[PDB]
Structures are given as C-alpha cells and as structure tokens.
C-alpha cells in the first residue's frame, strides 16, 4: 500500500505513535516519507546482508526474522514479511520498541539526516487528525 501523507498521519495516530517517546506525529510521517516514500512494501538490502522492511525500513540485523541474516536477532518477535502489510500495526509496534532502545529516532539514519531539527509539523499540515 502507498499511503498519502495525512492518511498515514491518521493511521499512525490510530496506532498510538503520536508523541510516542516524545516524538510528534510529523517526526514519524517525515521518517516514513524518507525511509519508504510511504510504501508499506518497500524492501532494501544493506551492504552487510541484512534487509530493511516496510514503511519505517526496520532492519533484520536486530528487529525481525527473514531467515537470511546470519547472527541477527528478532527483538520484535515477528517475521520481517509482517512489516510489509497494508495494516501498519506490526511496523508501529516494532518502531515503538526501536525508539525506546536508547537513541530515540536516531536509529533511523534518514530521520537524523533529513527530518531531525526541521519543521516536521509541515508533514501533518492541513490533516484532519
Ligand atoms: Cl508527501
Ligand atoms: Cl508534528
Ligand atoms: Cl536470519
Ligand atoms: Cl532475538
Ligand atoms: Cl519468522
Ligand atoms: Cl493501518
Ligand atoms: Cl529521545
Ligand atoms: Na533477524
């Protein structure tokens, strides 16, 4: 599924991400824009053989099981395929564990490089939330 901007903001609020760990909804929408372009089915292979999955590009090195990332963990206790669903529940639940892990949203390098410090409220501007 490819979300629209306000459609995703709404879905993220419905699943409890707005102001989770103090990160406003525009932070989460901005991270999703630059990680996946709002596409739930996005996959990207990393140099090290891990893969990033879904709207928030969650990495198989730590968070999900894809059966092909040697020496990796599955701390969200989910198959990485669950992170590709039209329903963002699995991605949100897992993202809550990642953002609680100690470095906040810096875990998302695209959020650090493209969203952190910017006017992230623009991402929810005009949305009926
Ligand atoms: Cl957009
Ligand atoms: Cl915001
Ligand atoms: Cl594996
Ligand atoms: Cl594990
Ligand atoms: Cl699995
Ligand atoms: Cl959803
Ligand atoms: Cl923080
Ligand atoms: Na893994």
Curated annotation (Swiss-Prot):
Superkingdom classification of source: Eukaryota
Catalytic reaction equation(s): Hydrolysis of (1->4)-beta-linkages between N-acetylmuramic acid and N-acetyl-D-glucosamine residues in a peptidoglycan and between N-acetyl-D-glucosamine residues in chitodextrins
GO CC list: cytoplasm; endoplasmic reticulum; extracellular space
InterPro entries, sorted: Glyco_hydro_22, Glyco_hydro_22_CS, Glyco_hydro_22_lys, Lysozyme-like_dom_sf
Enzyme class, broadest EC rank: hydrolase
GO molecular function, one term: identical protein binding
Pfam families: Lys
CDD domains per the UniProt record, alphabetical: LYZ_C
Locations listed in the record: Secreted
Disulphide-bridged cysteine pairs: 6-127, 30-115, 64-80, 76-94
Protein name: Lysozyme C
Organism, scientific name: Gallus gallus (Chicken)
Taxonomic path: Eukaryota, Metazoa, Chordata, Craniata, Vertebrata
